Amino acid sequence: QSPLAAYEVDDSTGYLTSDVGGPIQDQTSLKAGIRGPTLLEDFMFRQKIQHFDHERVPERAVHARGAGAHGTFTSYADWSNITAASFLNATGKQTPVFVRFSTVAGSRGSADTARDVHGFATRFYTDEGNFDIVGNNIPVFFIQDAIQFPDLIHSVKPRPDNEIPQAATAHDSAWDFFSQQPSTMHTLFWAMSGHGIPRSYRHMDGFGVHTFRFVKDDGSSKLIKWHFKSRQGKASLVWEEAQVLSGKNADFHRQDLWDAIESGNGPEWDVCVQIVDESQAQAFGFDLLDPTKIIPEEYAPLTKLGLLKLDRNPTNYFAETEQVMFQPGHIVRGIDFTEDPLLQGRLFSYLDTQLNRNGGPNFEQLPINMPRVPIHNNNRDGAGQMFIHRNKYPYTPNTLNSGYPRQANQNAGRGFFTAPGRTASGALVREVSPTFNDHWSQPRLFFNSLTPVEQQFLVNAMRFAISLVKSEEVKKNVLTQLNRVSHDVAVRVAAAIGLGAPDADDTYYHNNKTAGVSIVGSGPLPTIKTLRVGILATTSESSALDQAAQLRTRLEKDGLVVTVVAETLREGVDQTYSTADATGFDGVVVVDGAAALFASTASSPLFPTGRPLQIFVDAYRWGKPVGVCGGKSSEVLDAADVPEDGDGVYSEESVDMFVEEFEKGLATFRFTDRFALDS
């Protein structure tokens, strides 16, 4: 009775039919003789190849690369005291959800592990209509006015003469826009942090970005920010790992999410708001209409409203994930917009762009887009009309259908209503509020709030990206804008590109910090379930496979995903060295029984030269917990040049001691002492 159940098609049995139920074959063309030309009258051929010919639809203009899952939202309380929203109106109230995660710049097929902003779009199929929160993993946006979105996106997408390159943040046009449009600095700093390369969709947060309104039935309103706070904790890749992972497994994030749901480890978020009074719009030292600013948690704490859990994978990716069409216009009674000029223009874009993707106006009829309550309106006809409307008088006002459907409003049929306190006053202007003009304080706040090695990673990400800018003018302009946020950042970045930084300009410099934005500083992960352990073994020593089988039992107990790697497959071995890479693991364990594979002179026609040692060395250099289990453990760490007294290096004869130490390393997740800092 859910529109998805009714539309499920089972092909587990039966004879092949046309789309109109006529049994057919589809394996040989109809020909004038056994070596003859194909006949036009072969309808079986044409219906099949026409469908194939038309399978593709336009990719999303942005966030083209992504993956979705089904789940549930459960309210923690009756939130009537702050909003009329029905999905929040009772303790334990459950609403089905669909979520799609994404990058922003890359086309379909682009790697998940690009450095990019990420999408986090949540549909609540509420009992008063579909409500979408179309958010990002970063709480601030590049630009202050929706009319600028094509300029931003044209600048970060590939240069349009050759469609090169697919590196959003690593070409001239992107840094030209960033340096010419200083609003971009706050999101740029977030994108150059580990938030640009999250470990998974499950290990990042969701943000509505915009200030919205909570509207009560009495018509009063408060200003809110949405925060979806991950229960898996926060985690990043390191860049040099992200680049290899983009080649070895372009599907890493979609596969991570799919596997977590299949294993009963469906990811969870606390859905939260900051709530402040209308009178505080300009009280925090910036404008709450400005989507380049966060409200520091010290000024306004998070309230937990409910639990978001994703626990079911799609049946058909195309029908569900590709076709889901989100809109901030999908709003419900008890929520209202703000005069954020970015949000304001979004409302137009998402209704319009679905005409491009769907090719017709009836996109809300696709099962994934349908609501879970009756539809009563006078919308008619259009390509792909799937309803048969009984009301032959679809106009208001009518007597011939007894005045149905009835208007809904603040006082009728639980209508949506605009927050009745809202006003507008002044000239009809194309002018930016001077309250929006501080582009550099919050980037500085964010930078101050990261740990020293985290600041190094961000500087290194900028050194990497800006070094690939060919224009000396663009590079100069970039250092000018970076210098307004932090002289130190402009100096350290200028060092990698052989330019002089501008002289300190302390206009926007400050020492303030804010909790909750650091990944490095966010402490050990609250759970290690789903984390990936590579056990490097060998088929040559039956001791090595026993060591591996004993580590496997002890690690699988704690919900770790264990891969035993050997030269060849056999029972208890999951993967060959040939297909194995350190990007596939959160921690790597060598069984000392396999010590001979790590020799400088080790060679095999079954995997590339040096593969076993490369996995262990890559894992170590990328900051992961690594260890040798067995007794000649000290022996093998020398081959690797991996110091046995190293933080996050494990060397035990006992399996139980090895795992107990190693599992703490997985929770630590990254050993940041292995990364050099500027002097």
**Active-site residue list:** 63, 136
Residue of the chain from 194, 208, 233, 306 that contacts Ca ion (CB under 5 A)? 194
Of residues 47 and 220, the one with the C-beta less far from its own copies: 47
Q: Is 63 annotated as a binding residue?
A: yes
Residue of the chain from 72, 80, 180, 280 that contacts its own copies (CB under 8 A)? 180
Identify what 121 binds: its own copies, ligand HEM, Ca ion, none; CB under 5 to 8 Å per kind: ligand HEM
Q: Is 380 annotated as a binding residue?
A: no
Identify what 1 binds: its own copies, Ca ion, ligand HEM, none; CB under 5 to 8 Å per kind: none
Within 323-417, strands assigned E span: 335-336
For the CB of residue 615, give the shortest distance to Ca ion in the complex, in Å: 22
Residue of the chain from 220, 280, 365, 480 that contacts its own copies (CB under 8 A)? 365
341 binds ligand HEM (CB under 6 A): no
Of 44-52, 230-238, 524-532, 574-582, which segment contacts Ca ion by CB under 5 A?
A: 230-238
Of residues 272 and 469, the one with the C-beta less far from its own copies: 469
Q: Are 276 and 300 in contact (CB under 8 A)?
A: yes
The encoded tokens of residue 327 equal 């809109």
Question: Which parts of 413-472 interact with Ca ion (CB under 5 A)?
Answer: 417-418
Cα distance from N-terminal residue to C-terminal residue, the chain: 65
Q: Is 492 annotated as a binding residue?
A: no
The amino acid occupying position 103 is: T
Instruction: Kindly give the residue spans of alpha helices, DSSP state H, lying in 439-571.
Output: 441-448, 452-466, 472-485, 487-496, 542-556
Count residues binding Ca ion (CB under 5 A).
Answer: 10
The encoded tokens of residue 176 equal 């030209």
Of 349-357, 579-587, 605-613, 628-636, which segment contacts ligand HEM by CB under 6 A?
A: 349-357
Residue of the chain from 47, 353, 435, 539 that contacts ligand HEM (CB under 6 A)? 353
Q: Using CA atoms in the order 560, 566, 568, 570, what is the torsion angle rounded to 10 degrees?
A: -50
- Calpha distance 58→354 (Å, rounded): 10
Residue of the chain from 75, 83, 89, 102 that contacts ligand HEM (CB under 6 A)? 102
Distances in Å between the Cα of 260 and the Cα atoms of 201, 256, 504 are 11, 6, 48
Residue of the chain from 67, 85, 170, 325 that contacts ligand HEM (CB under 6 A)? 325
- Calpha distance 387→389 (Å, rounded): 6
Residue owning tokens 């690939």: 468
Identify what 81 binds: ligand HEM, Ca ion, its own copies, none; CB under 5 to 8 Å per kind: none
CA 469 distance to own-chain centroid? 27
Give the residue among 443, 509, 515 at the shortest CA–CA distance from 299. 515
Question: Which parts of 503-532 interact with its own copies (CB under 8 A)?
Answer: none
Of residues 46 and 510, the one with the C-beta less far from its own copies: 46
Of residues 81 and 399, the one with the C-beta less far from its own copies: 399
Of 302-310, 365-373, 504-512, 550-558, which segment contacts its own copies by CB under 8 A?
A: 365-373
- Judged by DSSP in three states, 135 sits in strand
For the CB of residue 121, give the shortest distance to ligand HEM in the complex, in Å: 4
Secondary element (H or E) of residue 546: helix 542-556
Beta sheet of 561-566, edge-to-edge order: 575-576, 561-566, 532-536, 587-591, 626-629, 649-652
Residue of the chain from 85, 88, 146, 535 that contacts ligand HEM (CB under 6 A)? 146
136 binds ligand HEM (CB under 6 A): yes
Evaluate the CA torsion angle 521, 522, 528, 533 in order and state its sign.
negative
Residue owning tokens 């006992």: 654
121 binds ligand HEM (CB under 6 A): yes
Residues 6+ apart with CB under 8 A from 671: 623, 624, 625, 646, 647, 648, 665
Q: Is 141 annotated as a binding residue?
A: yes
345 binds ligand HEM (CB under 6 A): yes
Q: Are 260 and 267 in contact (CB under 8 A)?
A: yes
The amino acid occupying position 619 is: A
- Calpha distance 38→25 (Å, rounded): 15
346 binds ligand HEM (CB under 6 A): yes
Identify what 136 binds: Ca ion, its own copies, ligand HEM, none; CB under 5 to 8 Å per kind: ligand HEM
Q: Are 72 and 122 in contact (CB under 8 A)?
A: no
Give the residue among 292, 351, 293 at the shortest CA–CA distance from 143. 292
Of residues 19 and 53, the one with the C-beta less far from ligand HEM: 53
Distances in Å between the Cα of 339 and the Cα atoms of 146, 184, 356 are 12, 20, 27
Q: Is 149 annotated as a binding residue?
A: yes
Secondary element (H or E) of residue 133: strand 129-136
Q: Is 131 annotated as a binding residue?
A: no
Of residues 385 and 514, the one with the C-beta less far from its own copies: 385
Residue of the chain from 70, 93, 100, 186 that contacts ligand HEM (CB under 6 A)? 100
Of 121-129, 169-177, 363-371, 603-611, which segment contacts Ca ion by CB under 5 A?
A: 169-177
Backbone interruptions in the chain following residues (C to N > 2.5 Å): none
Q: Is 652 annotated as a binding residue?
A: no
What residues pair up with 72 in beta bridges, in sequence order?
96, 309
Residue of the chain from 87, 98, 131, 141 that contacts ligand HEM (CB under 6 A)? 141
- Judged by DSSP in three states, 70 sits in strand
Of residues 206 and 630, the one with the C-beta less far from ligand HEM: 206
229 binds ligand HEM (CB under 6 A): no
- Judged by DSSP in three states, 280 sits in helix
For the CB of residue 622, give the shortest distance to its own copies in the complex, in Å: 9
- Judged by DSSP in three states, 657 sits in helix
Identify what 364 binds: Ca ion, ligand HEM, its own copies, none; CB under 5 to 8 Å per kind: its own copies
Of residues 119 and 266, the one with the C-beta less far from ligand HEM: 119
| Binding-residue pattern over the window 109 to 148 for its own copies, x denoting contact by CB under 8 A | xxx-x-------------------------------xxxx
- Calpha distance 303→284 (Å, rounded): 19
Q: Quote the DSSP letter at residue 236.
A: B
Question: CB burial class (10 A; 0-12, 13-18, 19+) of residue 20?
Answer: exposed
Q: Is 390 annotated as a binding residue?
A: no
Q: Is 611 annotated as a binding residue?
A: no
Residue of the chain from 579, 644, 646, 664 that contacts its own copies (CB under 8 A)? 579
344 binds ligand HEM (CB under 6 A): no
The encoded tokens of residue 348 equal 């137009």
Please enumerate, by residue number, every residue annotated as part of a binding site for heme d cis-diol. Answer: 60, 63, 100, 141, 149, 350, 354, 357
Chain residues that interact with ligand HEM, rule: CB under 6 A = 49, 53, 60-63, 66, 100, 102, 119, 121, 134-136, 141, 146, 149, 209-210, 291, 324-326, 342, 345-346, 349-350, 353-354, 357
Pick out the residues of the known binding site: 60, 63, 100, 141, 149, 236, 350, 354, 357, 364
Residue list for the binding site for Ca(2+): 236, 364
